[PDB]
Symmetry: D3
Subunit: 233 residues, 6 copies
Amino acid sequence: HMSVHIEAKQGEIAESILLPGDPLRAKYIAETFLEDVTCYNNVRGMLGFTGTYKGKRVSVQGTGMGVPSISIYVNELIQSYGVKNLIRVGTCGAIQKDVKVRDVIIAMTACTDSNMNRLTFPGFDFAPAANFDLLKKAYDAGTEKGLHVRVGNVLTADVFYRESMDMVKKLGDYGVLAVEMETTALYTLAAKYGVNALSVLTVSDHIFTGEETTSEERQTTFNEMIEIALDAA
Amino acid sequence: MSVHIEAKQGEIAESILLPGDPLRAKYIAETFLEDVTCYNNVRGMLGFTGTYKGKRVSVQGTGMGVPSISIYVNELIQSYGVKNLIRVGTCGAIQKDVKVRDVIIAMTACTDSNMNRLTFPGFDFAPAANFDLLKKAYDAGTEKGLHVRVGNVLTADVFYRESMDMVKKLGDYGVLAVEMETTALYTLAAKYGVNALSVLTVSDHIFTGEETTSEERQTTFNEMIEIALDAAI
Amino acid sequence: HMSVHIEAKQGEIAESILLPGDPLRAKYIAETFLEDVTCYNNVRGMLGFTGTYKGKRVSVQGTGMGVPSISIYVNELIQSYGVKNLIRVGTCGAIQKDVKVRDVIIAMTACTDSNMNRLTFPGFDFAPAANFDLLKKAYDAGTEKGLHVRVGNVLTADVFYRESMDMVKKLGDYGVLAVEMETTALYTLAAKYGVNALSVLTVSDHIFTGEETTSEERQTTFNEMIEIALDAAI
Amino acid sequence: MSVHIEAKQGEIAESILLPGDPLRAKYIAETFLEDVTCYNNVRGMLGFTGTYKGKRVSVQGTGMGVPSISIYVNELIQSYGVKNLIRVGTCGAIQKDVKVRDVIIAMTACTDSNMNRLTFPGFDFAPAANFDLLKKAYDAGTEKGLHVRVGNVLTADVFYRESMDMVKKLGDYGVLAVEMETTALYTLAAKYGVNALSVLTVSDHIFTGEETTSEERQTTFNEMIEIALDAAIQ
Amino acid sequence: MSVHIEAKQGEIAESILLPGDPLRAKYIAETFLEDVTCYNNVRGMLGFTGTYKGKRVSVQGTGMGVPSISIYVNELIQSYGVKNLIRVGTCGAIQKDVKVRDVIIAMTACTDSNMNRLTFPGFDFAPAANFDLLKKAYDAGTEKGLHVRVGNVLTADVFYRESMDMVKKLGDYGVLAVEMETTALYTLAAKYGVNALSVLTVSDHIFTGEETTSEERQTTFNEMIEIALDAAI
Amino acid sequence: HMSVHIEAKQGEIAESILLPGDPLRAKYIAETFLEDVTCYNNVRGMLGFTGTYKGKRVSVQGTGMGVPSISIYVNELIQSYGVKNLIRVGTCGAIQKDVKVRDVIIAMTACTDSNMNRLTFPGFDFAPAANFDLLKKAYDAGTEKGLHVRVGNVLTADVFYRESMDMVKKLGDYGVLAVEMETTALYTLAAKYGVNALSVLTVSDHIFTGEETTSEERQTTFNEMIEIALDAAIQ
Ligand SMILES: [Cl-]
Ligand SMILES: [Cl-]
Ligand SMILES: [Cl-]
Ligand SMILES: [Cl-]
Ligand SMILES: [Cl-]
Ligand SMILES: [Cl-]
């Protein structure tokens, strides 16, 4: 048995997994951080690797952009591959006026403009929570490394190119720290299946102040975040 | 003074415990607090200020449901300079592994209330606990040996619900317990830039039918007040 | 048998009851209007009393503030105590341009920003109606007394402190008379259980003109509202 | 001249009956009115003006459903100065004990329609009948031995509905009958500060299957027409 | 006999045109048909059957709005065995390049009606024209020289709209024109497995204010009915 | 100027473009049907190529899965690279009782699960339409090649693994043909920017009967589908 979008053999994927978004970031992580690495998937070029880190097996799996894409992969990892701990390491755009580029956000929960949870719970606002043990580990370890760590809510957006920004500014005004595109799907599915999830994101740019950052510029932060995510897993 | 509180300026402390029942606000003030004053008896919604471990702290009845607690939180924050707000009380467990006497620290809340859908049309607002407060309570509770569960809760907008299917499904998706206030607190605290948390003792399990008398859970309850006082001070 | 939020013995609560939000107003009503009074409930300080008015037993019960709070008490009064006629008394903020302080509003229906009926009838607007017999009795007693009584819709608001007043202004522009926080709960649950409800409200202030009244300034209008609610109820 | 009515200014009276079917408007004009002119034949949606006890009064056919009656009502009020509007119609009973030939005077309307959700996003809008017209009709209806009931109705967009589950549940919450116009009528009258009422005979029972013939309903219809005409002219 | 149509079985043709106005149905039958019979006078909602190019065909007034047309379409399908239903009439243009006298052939419709949300809670239902009918009508129209535009329309529930900002926004998103019926026709035809289409003449432009009298656009209207008739048979 | 997710120079991408979800499928199309081919992108490994087909420049670009992924690429293609005709080629699951595997669905419109359009038009059901000239072209070309072409509505889903299938079942009862995950985004944005879109889809499986198909079993049908989409895009 393999899932429809992942060609991995049963057992090839570790119980712990990083979800760095771009498949080429998964490759970067595997080559740079992991020993004895296997590439267990190339379907749709969505690279997935298993290797060893401090004597433990651990996986890194590219997902695409957005709730529907990540929901497909997460569903498959949990359901078909028995994956227990899932840490998204990614970027976000700040939407709160004093959040700064290079800040690292640990998502306690996620707001959304997605209908995904509306269908599951008609008439309810479902607010999916992070796994607290993962979150507290990440917080502690990020603080030890001198990362500009914030713990709070984010917005999981369906639309990267949004014509009206009024309501995301408003979410800004109620303390929502940043916007990204996957976290609600990851946290909601982890909760559904009784497994552990966390999103750890770096602010790559500010949506209102215009402040922006280069990927070279985010490299030192990103590398500390991958090590944090790995240790936590 | 505000429309629902007759306190003068300076009669209410910066940090405050927010039970629903005003007779529990009295119990807590008389039990835990020294040099207590009663600054409010409008609507019988008793509120007190005293000292805990030498430090000034208040306790205010909120009444039941989102709309009632919202009035008091708005007025405490806007008129009285309150900065730290901790809801304390009980809840009904709905997740399969949650037990009577467990203490729930809400990371977020789900709701069937329309208060946030009106504010952010088309969005699911996931209101978030203050993390600093939350880590303080968690750490205080764990040091004590309480079975502290950090996760989401359902803020119900109805107590006598016609069907339990949706609350059962929410519990299937990991939602720990049900209560009727925390999304209001978390949302307003976020809106005003102040710090909020909800710490709740499980009095019964809604699906297993495990129940507990308030006498039966008194020392757990006392320890919840303890950790909540520690976190606020 | 006692409900969860009411410690009354079976038979201690009359079939007709007034439902003020404030349990200290419940107490004032009982001591001011009623003979041979008993306080049947102290749980949560949510005072409830039974007394006699014009030779009839009638009750008075604090409900707290908002839909979720009144819905608990109303459910328990009907289900556990066989209460049959339920009259919400209290104040309201005028939003229609011709409504005045001291006017008494009798709610034919209520609009709301509460989710309560949206779970129950998804895709529908449910318009909860007052019991017409009660409504008529109170209107007739009000007009005989000389009160400026107005029959129309009200807003049952879920939020006292509203960031924007644009929508409540628009509702007032569409003839919605006043804003308060309870009556849709009462009307819907009364309808659900086949019992009779009415809200009769004194205007305390006008939200858009700024006209305000103190509780002392309107005590006489309020006391007369209570009399007509008691007359309608018994 | 409005877009759907060809009447010249002054040819339509202040007060108007809305019998639905244009052939009922013609029936009402010919049987009850004197000195009648037909002011409109556009879309065959016949409108007449005549005198009743010395006072001018109109009778205007409207179409089926919220969107059609909204057209006619808007143009009636805005273009022609109509201040009093009375729907004289029929309905289907959805409540277990409501009977055919019962006459329902609607205090409010529930709805299927989206019309009010666009206007008041996030709100349930509950439109109120004019109370003075309503009590007038109730009193006159009861004096004529009509089987009068005062309550809420369901304004439906869909005459032929897949699932009756929810309209059964509305009956269980005391909703009496289903029709297709009054939420529009009551909402627009409120918006423009004018007076409206719906008075409806049960022609069928949606669940028991009981039905009536136009002839079986006639003596009742004729009493309702007289009641509506008097209220119109007073 | 259905409840709103008094016709005998066999008196209504399998192919039918559906103007809103019954007097426009009268005009169509008198202007275009031989051997015409008026088969319905209930509510004065006139319906006719006559012969066009050797073929029996009907014309039936539907009145105005989703709820009216739905009554008529249900009955024609379920009681009278009708197979092809083509709505004819006028529309108000809202897209910037659409002109008066253009003919709109609706591929789909948007709507502010709740009819379909109620049936498919959580979903936007997009009703489809029957492609066969649509292609026939398009070829007939382009053969004739008419400026036929194929795309979407707004099936509006209100004629007198408080604000035009949303219909303006729909025009900006390419929605061609506004009318009040096609969602009902397309959804019901599709539900019962029959064939439907709307072909409409632009009477005016909502935003440019270009307008046309019924007399001024008569020739275009007449050619529109010709192509509808040809498509139907 | 490059867009944020595409590393192409201005003018490297043709005005007509095919949009498979899978980048390795874009590669297959380019290598198999195109001459003089250049790979202009692999940021995120979301491969894009430009080549020539019947003497005309045409491009092929992976979009990824779901409304939010395809919306990103389509926005950037139109706004950053001036693309004008856009055809999604893909597979779908049949949800209507008479639709069969290997049918090719040409989507007139899309129903949806997504809140994308409800946000933009509160209180409205927005129904986005294919470009009709593209649609008519594809239909004629596909029927000539003997494809099992159907013209109708589809469902654009946010969820691949749905817990309950009852609404999609009901949607099928109302004539919706199949389920996929992208076309409401493609049609909506295309119409917003005044450009031309179509989705042409091969049924790979049937949601309710369970009939399934191998990618080998789909290949002759998919190959023809690619050609009619190229034909329709360049004409
Ligand atoms: Cl204990
Ligand atoms: Cl509601
Ligand atoms: Cl007074
Ligand atoms: Cl009509
Ligand atoms: Cl993807
Ligand atoms: Cl073949």
